[PDB]
Design a protein around this nucleic acid. Structure first.
Lengths: 149, 129, 73, 141, 61
RNA sequence: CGGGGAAUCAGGGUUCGAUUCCGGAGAGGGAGCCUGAGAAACGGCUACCACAUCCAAGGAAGGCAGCAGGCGCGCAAAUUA
RNA sequence: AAAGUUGCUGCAGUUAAAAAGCUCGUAGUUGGAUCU
RNA sequence: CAAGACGGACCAGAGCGAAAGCAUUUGCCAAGAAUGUUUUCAUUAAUCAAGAACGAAAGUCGGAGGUUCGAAGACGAUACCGUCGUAGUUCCGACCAUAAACGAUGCCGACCGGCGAUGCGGCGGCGUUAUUCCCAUGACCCGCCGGGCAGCUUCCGG
RNA sequence: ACGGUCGAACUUGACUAUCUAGAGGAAGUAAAAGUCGAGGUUUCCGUAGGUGAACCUGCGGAAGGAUCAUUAACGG
């Protein structure tokens, strides 16, 4: 049951039962850590880092290998963004929809989807302000949105 | 969304027993569900059950016996004294000879007779006959 | 904390309605005297107050102890 | 469905209040606009001064002419129509007699044959109709 | 004004005809509303006074 | 007027409590006092408002939501022992 | 009281009275598994 | 030749959208469901008072255009019908917020019979086709999984 | 006796609300037989117009309205 859509699908990932690191992978935890560091210094989100490590380096689950997940690894070395990934992508999508709405006035579909996107933004921002990730004065505005991107 | 996993477990057990099945699979598992099933089990209602351990919330496979008429949950968990227990008994049980109101009390999850034995009231969870 | 040497706290309780065997949230606002010895006290923390003689028209309790919020360092 | 949570007492009580206000017996008893319209004013009996005698035609399946009294109540000046049973009893009522009147029986609803009347005459000249019909008493004039 | 519009119609003459049509509709709607209100008044008066007629002054003697 | 409580009552409830017990209020309506330990007292006083009594026409006197009793009001309630 | 015709226990809402034209949305209500 | 209109047949037990609704080609813009996932976060969720956005048709204000149709209306016959025809039907910008706005049938979650059709995505496989195509790919064939639209059958129960 | 304070009340305006006497206005019934000269049957919903209603018509919507026959391929 999607939160803003009437559809409901089962597409997700099924992690295996074995949490052990397989014996064919010769990489150590530290080597994966500098791989994460160099993949983060070029400007990648933790999800992109995990996808790249899974597809080419054989790192099936980095938190099973290193013991920490990617965001905590990046926050330990200070290579973490001041705003999290999903809120950033929702804000970027809202900026794109607002730009399209400014150039195209009679798109009421775009207005509806913009209201849905910014409702997502406010829910996620409220959650992050609860957990002390964002400052308690953080506020998403229409006109000062692209300055955050 | 899925609220009250014990309600789902009891509803699935009741629906499978109505259909005359010999085994039922209930997911997810929890401590309260296993305690409730043990309370039924020591009274001879659901035989014996397996707990399947994934790294998620578990699953349970229960071997039905045909002895169950109805197992039921009470939501919300009302607060039951030791003087309101008779009123609950007449409301929920079919007779004074069989059936089980289940409480959770500070001495554990147990039934109404042993709650009256231990001189403790608690919260209502279910009934089975 | 908008008054001179006086704060307003809120007590939340759960009143029992007995026909339905249910509860309802209720609150009571309470004006209490905050002594200046309690520095760095802020909105959202738990004050323990004791009853005294009437200090004003609406103030009858007096702040005795302050415990910080659930996350405030 | 209906809310079942442990903290839902306010909604249950408010909803039962506002849905009690839809039962027309409850609203008739509690709105107070049905006692300000009641000629008896919430009383069981009322005395009145006879204005005239009227003949009320019965309804369509029963063809007859029932006979009633148009009477003005003393205590509030409201005029009503009361039912005196028969010509046996109607001749005991003259104009400008003080009659004690009751309801007819259906708590403010009309007679099963004659419409617009909710009241029946119980006493005339401070003596009952039953003791005059049965000859036990006579009425002073 | 039941004048068919012409294919060689010019400005300031089409606009006058259209303005006349809209104004005609405006006072026609206004007097329709007035007639409806007067009929509502008459209906309520008839209902109340027929209820009075069934209340008292009905009988033989 | 509030409460103890009353009617009904499978369980849950619904309705009532002017009324002999406890607490509050008032002594025709307001207001101000004196005395006293205690009253803003009314079977105490002083005004105004509304009533009402006696009179030689100048003046004087009053307060039954105490017990009886009366009038009025009413569907509705006792003996001046 | 009958009245499970006020329904917490305990009612109903296709065709009999009855579900908002649709979605978002604070308050309120409810909230997965896990620690001897 | 021009003017505005409207996109037949294909067009369906079909698809998309929150609903109202959506059908000529190509290009641009930004959304989107499902699928696949050994990605990331780690409870961030469900429902709606207040509040907000859209909302067929008709209708109202202003600009443009008026092809066809056409309320009212003028004629002719007998409320029906014919000829002519105004507003409107059309586009742009603001109001209106109503429909038999229908599944006359809240939303989220769990369980509870069968069958094979179909739309999309993924997977596995003999094989045929691009004149025995010289490996892959599109078009078919068989089977499976997931979310769908929608049927038939059943003494599940109601 | 001045002043202060509590303060019943009185007068004048406005807002109201009630009780009362009301010219006049617009009315129903009983009595006046005095006067003049229809129709719809498929059913609806939302709007707008027609003489107010009804009914008819314009545009959009619904069935809550009675599915026979041909049709897998068969041309490559």
């Amino acid at each position: 049951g999607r939160m803003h859509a009437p559809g409901k699908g089962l597409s997700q990932s099924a992690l295996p039962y074995r949490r052990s690191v397989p014996t064919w992978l010769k990489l150590t935890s530290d080597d994966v850590k500098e791989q994460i560091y160099k993949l983060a210094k070029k400007g990648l989100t933790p999800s992109q880092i995990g996808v790249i490590l899974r597809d080419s380096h054989g790192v099936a689950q980095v938190r099973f290998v290193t013991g920490n997940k990617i965001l905590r690894i990046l926050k330990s070395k200070g290579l973490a963004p001041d705003l999290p990934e999903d809120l950033y992508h929702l804000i970027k999508k809202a900026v794109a929809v607002r730009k399209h709405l400014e150039r195209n006035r009679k798109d009421k579909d775009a207005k509806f989807r913009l209201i849905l996107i910014e409702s997502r933004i406010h829910r996620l921002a409220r959650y992050y302000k609860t957990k002390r990730v964002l400052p308690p004065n953080w506020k998403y505005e229409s006109s000062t949105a692209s300055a955050l991107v | 969304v899925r609220m009250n996993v014990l309600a789902d477990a009891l509803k699935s057990i009741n629906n499978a027993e109505k259909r005359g099945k010999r085994q039922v699979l209930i997911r997810p598992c929890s401590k309260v569900i296993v305690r409730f099933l043990t309370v039924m089990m020591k009274h001879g209602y659901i035989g014996e059950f397996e707990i399947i351990d994934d790294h998620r919330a578990g699953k349970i496979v229960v071997n039905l016996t045909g002895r169950l008429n109805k197992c039921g949950v009470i939501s919300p968990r009302f607060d039951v004294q030791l003087k309101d227990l008779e009123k609950w008994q007449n409301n929920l049980l079919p007779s004074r000879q069989f059936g089980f109101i289940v409480l959770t009390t500070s001495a554990g999850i147990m039934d109404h007779e042993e709650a009256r034995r231990k001189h403790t009231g608690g919260k209502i969870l279910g009934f089975f006959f | 904390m908008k008054m001179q040497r006086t704060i307003v706290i809120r007590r939340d309780y759960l009143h029992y309605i007995r026909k339905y065997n249910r509860f309802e949230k209720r609150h009571k606002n309470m004006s209490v005297h905050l002594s200046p010895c309690f520095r760095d006290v802020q909105i959202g923390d738990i004050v323990t107050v004791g009853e005294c003689r009437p200090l004003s028209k609406t103030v009858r309790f007096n702040v005795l102890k302050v415990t910080k919020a659930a996350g405030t360092k | 469905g209906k809310c079942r949570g442990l903290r839902t007492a306010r909604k249950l009580r408010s909803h039962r209040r506002d849905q009690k206000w839809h039962d027309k017996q409850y609203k008739k008893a509690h709105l107070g606009t049905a006692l300000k319209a009641n000629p008896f004013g919430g009383a069981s009996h009322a005395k009145g001064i006879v204005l005239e005698k009227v003949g009320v035609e019965a309804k369509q399946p029963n063809s007859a002419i029932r006979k009633c009294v148009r009477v003005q109540l003393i205590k509030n000046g409201k005029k009503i129509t009361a039912f005196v049973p028969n010509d046996g009893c109607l001749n005991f009522i003259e104009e400008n007699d003080e009659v004690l009147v009751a309801g007819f029986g259906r708590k403010g609803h009309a007679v099963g044959d004659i419409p617009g009347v909710r009241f029946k005459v119980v006493k005339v000249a401070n003596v009952s109709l039953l003791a005059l019909y049965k000859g036990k008493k006579e009425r002073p004039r | 004004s039941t004048q068919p519009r012409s294919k060689n119609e010019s400005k300031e003459d089409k606009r006058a005809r259209k303005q006349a049509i809209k104004e005609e509709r405006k006072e026609r709607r206004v007097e329709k509303k007035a007639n409806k209100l007067a009929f509502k008044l008459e209906k309520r008066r008839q209902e109340k006074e027929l209820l009075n007629l069934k209340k008292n002054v009905e009988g033989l003697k």
